[PDB]
């Protein structure tokens, strides 16, 4: 069939003392407000129009989505109001859904039911009983039929009993909507949109209502302790989810996913490991504590040691990486190469079985298959930034300076604490060798 | 007496997606079956006879345990059939417990209650009531009498009220055990274990039963959530008897042990410390946030920085290691020595009161007391390995390396960025200095 | 008005089995007898009266503090015989608040309410009721009036179902109070602080009662178990002020604050961070997963 | 405990004493003149705790209904253990095969020996000792005080 949704984000976040819009704020590293985008992407909403107050450009801005159908609004004086000024905007062959940008965790399935439940020339709504309702919309019903909302506020005693209450997400026909819409008052001073259950029971039509899974699904974010509780939710869910398709987390609630994890089987995670952007781990991969990996590729049956940082690196199968380890963009690990502590890699490749065990930095460097970087050596790169090439058996000693561009052929040697300005020839040994001089009997300062 | 055990472990594990049998997944660091044999060592069992289907080879590999009684299992066809295969191995005048090899956190203390709640010629049997029973089988008792088992299955609306049911753990001679077992039926196609049950009431026979103490020592393991709960629980346990005997851990519930640790008075750990192997540690000492610990021995009121990773890595009393420094195997710290960030150390010993403070990496090395080694120093020792040996007294300048087999005497001095390949003598130093080179107005690519 | 404090902490930590007086152990790195005196400070306490047995010298060491007003104590004899030996040191037109060492998490507020209820020439007493009772003082009252208590030792099956406890926090007149106390006997041999509840409805005077708001404000520590919950307690509470006053904890669980932060507008703390000292961050700040920071300003 | 000085927690204890018991009459003249007047009188109560008190064991049961013990301080009190001892009488004589029309309208005041097949209707009353022979009839509102029907 045809629907579209609209997202109410129209508000002042206060509570939130922030410089930043409040449904803009991430929740596991993207903005609440996206989703319910994404949510309303996975209904098949043809359109999503977005009402907004306040906050207007770095809005739109922030979110490029040049998709989205945006609607300025006066100064927040209405929800019913917001819901005026995208009224307009409803084709009458379309259901129309409401969603909030600041409930970040409500569930297709819960929305696909309320468009299930939404009686031909009616209103689908979404309701919830609460252990304690004492501040919110009472769900009114006569013989367990829904004919109106009561606010908190004028509620008789005998009302603040009513368990159920209203999320403020339903649906509605387009046509039907833009009717029951433009035909309420505004004598809080304000036009509440509560009022369309009654003015629908008004000219005859049924109210049906569906509840979602979990409380968590309808939770609100006013403040910055509020988000956080969701963004635990939020955690624990995907690491459920992660072990129940096969992934080992030693403890899933020190575990975080900021993205996406495509996995393998038999994967080992450890404690306090964050996983961010798009990551893809190979079969028998183990991840030692601490570990970030953001945008990552790891090969079968690697090891990453812990308080290992990766960022757009790859790693091929059998490679060994930390503790203590930084690969940055661009780093790359042929099948079985190690890379130790205290060592960084920026667009570098390290062949098959190479080893750089300690203490160096390797940037913008090629380097070959079975090849020995020495603890403490550096390519000097930096003088944009120039190539260092390695080829095949290749040693070279501790504390050497690798001065780009420079090339080392096959089966070099390369003496300790060498400083290498000019290429080097297969087989050659370079000794940078000076003398050491002696005096006898020296007294220390 | 006598007492024997059998772990049944032969079901498939397919909920685990693994290519490793489920049994041999570990908790806290060593799989779910040993923690059922441990127990049953503890218990003084005689023998322990393992039932298994698949997974066979691998299993018993990955088992060395040379002192097991393996049964093997055409392929799992009863849980009943399994206890068969088993049967012609009980001695006549030895108690039979069965456990499962999924089930790793049944206490002695349980099963040395089922044991004694053994009526002669009879059953002790384990049982649990349950919150919401609503799958397993129920206890069917007739004026609190046990008389049988009842599969959720066929359960009548009556039975499934029955909170109280089988964790499946029970007790009997053996000589009653292999009467009662082979004379059951296979008309699910398969021997259901319950019938033992009725089979007992039966011939008269009276089937006791106690409860564990917490639900989660007959918690399964089917998959990797469950197993991840589990191994939770665990480590609560754990880190509650190390507060409570007397170590302060800042943080509980982010802290891990995998193994044993011993330890003397008024320890702190802080936060998200590992403790893998065997780690013994004396009085006073304090372990920063981070660290991983495997195999270590730590002297009285040593003190371990945040992020320090050690393994098989002795610290005399009153030393300082961290943050960000990395022992491995054959590391050691003489009384009072300090090892700083971005430090490795392998097959070394720092003397008394000894310093490497930086940037350092230090293997195959003998380093005597009151040592300085200057922040960049590399044991350039591999070219096997061999080794490097510093006297008492010695100062070490910055960027050395010590280029082994090398030795450096007592009171000798080493200027900064020197390369030493030949031995150096009692308070001698040693520059090996160049002239630094100048050109005027260098205009800077 | 005129108001001081008596900090009991006399005990031996036996089960804390450390070489360490036990209420100088810290909790978010801070002796636990320091967050009273704090509290105390809070109150306007113009006098601290401290009473230990031993542990003394390293007790007022570790404890510089040269504003104390210490008071030593035979060897643990009494709870109420520890009240004594501070009597003397009583004003009679102060009121005199009774707390515990072992007892960090009292707030200000639950003292602060403390001292409104209590009726001239009486007792204002701290109370708790208790989901399981099963093992501490039951406060005995008729028509709802407070009149003695009991230990849970002698209290009948009937008395064992008085859900409402003593958290063994009072106030009083300091002139009444040296009335009340040398007033009471020794036949576990001690003197109880207990009596002076009916040794007040004795002479007919009104003991009034407050409860605290959380049950963690009358936690004792025996043990580093029970200090270790009280540390988790603690953190959250930090960690959820500094969620609602703008600052965005990516996991307020992995948190931990053992000192101050001073703090602008938008910071972002990642998780497994630690705050020790001082710490001042300005606006828009970022802390990624597991750094310490200590006495630092970040601009 | 009296009701008088008790708790409100010891107000709570649902069992009551009836003021039956038993002893041993050897034991029960020691425990009583050691008892004192400091209401001015003396309780029975006491000699509870003044068994306790030398150390011996004080057991209890229950009647089976609350009218056993129920005590009469007034007529309308009276009249209501007239009730139940008349409904007890009434189902007694149903139970052993004499038919009651209406056992609430029905009075016992003294003996009923009674053969088979009995029928009596409402609001009769039996005085003194009435004995009745098989298949008799009492029709409503009759009085038989001390008669032998055959």
């Given at each position: 069939s045809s629907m579209s949704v609209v997202i109410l984000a129209a508000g002042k976040g206060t509570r939130m003392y922030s410089d930043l819009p409040k449904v803009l704020h991430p929740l596991a590293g993207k903005p609440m407000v996206q989703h319910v985008i994404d949510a309303a992407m996975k209904l098949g909403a043809q359109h999503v129009h977005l009402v907004y107050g306040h906050g207007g450009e770095l809005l739109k801005k922030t979110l490029a989505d040049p998709s989205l159908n945006w609607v300025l609004q006066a100064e927040q004086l209405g929800t019913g109001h917001a819901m005026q000024q995208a009224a307009p905007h409803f084709a009458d062959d379309e259901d129309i859904l409401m969603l909030y940008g600041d409930v970040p965790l409500i569930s297709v399935d819960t929305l696909q039911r309320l468009l299930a439940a939404k009686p031909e020339g009616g209103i689908g709504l979404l309701t919830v009983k609460l252990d304690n309702p004492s501040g919110y919309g009472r769900i009114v019903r006569e013989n367990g039929d829904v004919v109106g909302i009561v606010e908190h506020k004028d509620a008789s005693d005998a009302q603040r009993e009513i368990n159920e209450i209203n999320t403020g997400i339903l649906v509605a026909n387009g046509r039907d909507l833009k009717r029951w819409l433009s035909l309420l008052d505004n004598n809080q001073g304000e036009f509440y949109i509560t009022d369309i259950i009654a003015l629908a029971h008004a000219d005859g039509k049924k109210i049906a209502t569906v509840h979602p899974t979990r409380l968590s699904e309808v939770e609100g974010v006013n403040n910055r302790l509020q988000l956080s509780a969701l963004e635990r939710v939020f955690q624990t869910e995907q690491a459920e989810k992660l072990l129940l398709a096969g992934v080992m987390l030693l403890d899933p609630s020190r575990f975080d996913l900021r993205g996406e994890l495509t996995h393998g089987r038999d994967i080992t995670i450890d404690t306090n490991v964050i996983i961010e952007g798009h990551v893809i781990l190979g079969d028998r991969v183990r991840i030692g504590t601490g570990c970030v990996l953001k945008?990552?590729?790891?090969?079968?049956?690697?090891?990453?040691?812990?308080?290992?940082?990766?960022?757009?690196?790859?790693?091929?199968?059998?490679?060994?990486?930390?503790?203590?380890?930084?690969?940055?963009?661009?780093?790359?690990?042929?099948?079985?190469?190690?890379?130790?502590?205290?060592?960084?890699?920026?667009?570098?490749?390290?062949?098959?079985?190479?080893?750089?065990?300690?203490?160096?930095?390797?940037?913008?460097?090629?380097?070959?298959?079975?090849?020995?970087?020495?603890?403490?050596?550096?390519?000097?790169?930096?003088?944009?930034?120039?190539?260092?090439?390695?080829?095949?058996?290749?040693?070279?000693?501790?504390?050497?300076?690798?001065?780009?561009?420079?090339?080392?052929?096959?089966?070099?040697?390369?003496?300790?604490?060498?400083?290498?300005?000019?290429?080097?020839?297969?087989?050659?040994?370079?000794?940078?060798?000076?003398?050491?001089?002696?005096?006898?009997?020296?007294?220390?300062?």
């Open positions: 945008n990552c590729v790891i090969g079968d049956d690697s090891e990453i040691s812990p308080y290992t940082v990766l960022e757009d690196a790859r790693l091929d199968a059998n490679c060994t990486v930390g503790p203590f380890a930084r690969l940055r963009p661009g780093a790359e690990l042929a099948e079985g190469a190690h890379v130790g502590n205290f060592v960084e890699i920026k667009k570098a490749r390290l062949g098959k079985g190479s080893k750089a065990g300690h203490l160096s930095y390797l940037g913008d460097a090629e380097i070959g298959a079975g090849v020995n970087i020495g603890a403490g050596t550096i390519t000097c790169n930096y003088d944009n930034k120039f190539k260092t090439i390695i080829g095949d058996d290749v040693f070279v000693g501790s504390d050497t300076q690798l001065v780009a561009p420079v090339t080392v052929a096959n089966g070099a040697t390369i003496g300790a604490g060498t400083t290498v300005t000019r290429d080097v020839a297969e087989n050659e040994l370079v000794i940078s060798r000076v003398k050491q001089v002696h005096i006898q009997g020296w007294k220390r300062p």
